Amino acid sequence: RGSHMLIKTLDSNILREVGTLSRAVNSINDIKYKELKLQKGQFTFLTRICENPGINLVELSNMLKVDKATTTKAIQKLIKAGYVDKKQDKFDKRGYNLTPTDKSLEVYELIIEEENRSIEICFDNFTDEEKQVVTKLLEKMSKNVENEWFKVK
Amino acid sequence: RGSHMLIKTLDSNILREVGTLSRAVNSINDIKYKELKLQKGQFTFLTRICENPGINLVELSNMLKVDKATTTKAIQKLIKAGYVDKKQDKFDKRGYNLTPTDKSLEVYELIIEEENRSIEICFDNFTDEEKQVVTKLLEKMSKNVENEWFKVK
């Protein structure tokens, strides 16, 4: 702490704000999901598996915009914790299909409840028009960075 | 892959979009910063240290909206890689002040260049008015989730 000033060399604050928002939501999700052992992004992988049963690790990486190594490590942990089953694919011998276990089906509703609670917090004091606007413009930002990720990966 | 439908139980797509955008930018930053050994958020901690020399681990955690354990692990790695020096604080015996090393001062400009390049990608095809709007509304979202993080942490 001291006397501060704006950073003149950074063209925009937009990614700092996106990092702040993202670290904050994940730090808070780390509190809620510690007891369930779903902290550090685990709940993210789980929801996608529940929403798309049979998805494979490659598809799951592409959906989440991370590399396969990240996905592999997270899937191993979720299997060990009994949230996911993997089965070798019938047609590609080194693919796996991911499926949710009976356990994770109860948690799924819990997770979605939590997401809607975080969503409500994000939108505190938003008008409906602001909601729509920011929703749409984030989509546009998202698609730009998606495109780049497919080129660069 | 198959035939899909919208998830009716999720009040909004906004945090999915924020996760997509954030994972994508970090996955891309993991490519650019692999050679410098600044992947997995390391470059984030480093920039804050360069921008605020003398900052301590507690302040740095609060600025980045993560818990102190995360910060400690990242700082240890950055010291080991020679990007940061830590010194015990004169007045709180178990605080440390973080400072950038000579090495990291060259990288800092590189990192900021990269951030401006990512920013440009995010804003591809944006009008000036859209830029301002999304910038402002993300700030508002950010502040809501900040508040909650201070309550819950």
Numbering used by the authors:
A (entry chain A), B (entry chain A): 16 to 168
Sentences from the paper on this structure:
Diffraction data were collected to 2.3 Å resolution. We found that the crystal structure reveals MarRC.difficile to be a dimer, with each monomer consisting of six α-helices and a three-stranded antiparallel β-hairpin. In the crystal structure of MarRC.difficile there is one monomer in the asymmetric unit, with the dimer being composed of two subunits related by a crystallographic twofold rotation. Two helical regions, α1 and α6 (residues 9–27 in the N-terminus and residues 123–147 in the C-terminus, respectively), are closely juxtaposed and intertwine with the equivalent regions of the second subunit to form a dimer. The crystal structure also indicates that α-helices in the N- and C-terminal regions of each subunit interdigitate with those of the other subunit to form a hydrophobic core burying a surface area of 3100 Å2. The dimer is stabilized by several salt bridges, notably that between Arg16 and Glu74′ and that between Lys155 and Glu145′. In addition, a hydrogen bond between the side-chain carbonyl O atom of Glu66 and the guanidinium NH groups of Arg31′ enhances the stability of the dimeric structure. Structural analysis of MarRC.difficile indicated that two cysteine residues (Cys45 and Cys117) are located in the hydrophobic core; this may suggest that MarR in C. difficile is probably not an oxidation sensor.
Clostridium difficile is an anaerobic human pathogen that causes acute healthcare-associated diarrhoea. The MarR protein, as a member of the MarR family of multiple antibiotic resistance proteins, is a key global regulator in C. difficile. The transcription factors of the MarR family regulate diverse genes involved in multiple antibiotic resistance, the synthesis of virulence determinants and many other important biological processes.
